[PDB]
Amino acid sequence: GVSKLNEAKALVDELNRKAGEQSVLLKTKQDEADAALQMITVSMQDASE
Amino acid sequence: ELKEKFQSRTSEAAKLEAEVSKAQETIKAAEVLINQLDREHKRWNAQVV
């Protein structure tokens, strides 16, 4: 019992932070994509013109 | 170019966004046991001493 207390706490501590990171890096991908889109919008802005 | 960049880029953010939901489900599954274990741990204390 006592040992599994210690496995569990550690298991609970770091997967959550790790997901927290993963979301934080989804901001990175997703918004990098949304930057690439802004680059295109600007190119278009002169292309139709 | 940015067309072919953003495209591949979008396949990243959401496939990562797959893991964070599985991870979140796992965390949700884990929490259930945490709230029962809140009182139990201090019960587990007294036994062994």
Contact B27 A16 (CB under 8 A): yes
Residue A39 to residue A28: CA distance in whole angstroms: 16
**Closest residue in chain A to residue B23, using alpha carbons only:** A19
Contacts (Cβ under 8 Å, ≥6 apart) of A19? B20, B23, B24, B27
Contacts (Cβ under 8 Å, ≥6 apart) of A23? B20
Q: Which two tokens stand for residue B27?
A: 């965390």
Spell out which chain B residues touch chain A, with contact meaning CB-CB distance below 8 angstroms. 2-3, 5-6, 9-10, 12-13, 16-17, 19-20, 23-24, 26-27, 30, 33-34, 37, 41, 44, 48
Q: Which two tokens stand for residue B9?
A: 């880029």
Q: Which two tokens stand for residue A47?
A: 């292309």
Could you tell me which of A32, A44, A38 has the C-alpha nearest to residue B11?
Answer: A32
Question: Are B40 and A1 a contacting pair, CB within 8 Å?
Answer: no
Residue B42 to residue B6: CA distance in whole angstroms: 52
Render the burial of B7-41: b for 16+ CB within 10 Å, e for the rest: eebbebbeebeeebeebeeeeeeeeeeeeebeeee
Stated in angstroms to one decimal place, the resolution of this structure is: 3.4
CA distances from A22 to A1, A12, A48, B5, B14 (A): 32, 16, 38, 21, 11
Mutation target to probe the A interface, by most A beta carbons within 10 A, among B4, B12, B22 is B12
Expt. technique: X-ray
> Which residue type sits at A34?
D
User: How many other CB atoms are there within 10 angstroms of residue A36's CB atom?
Assistant: 19
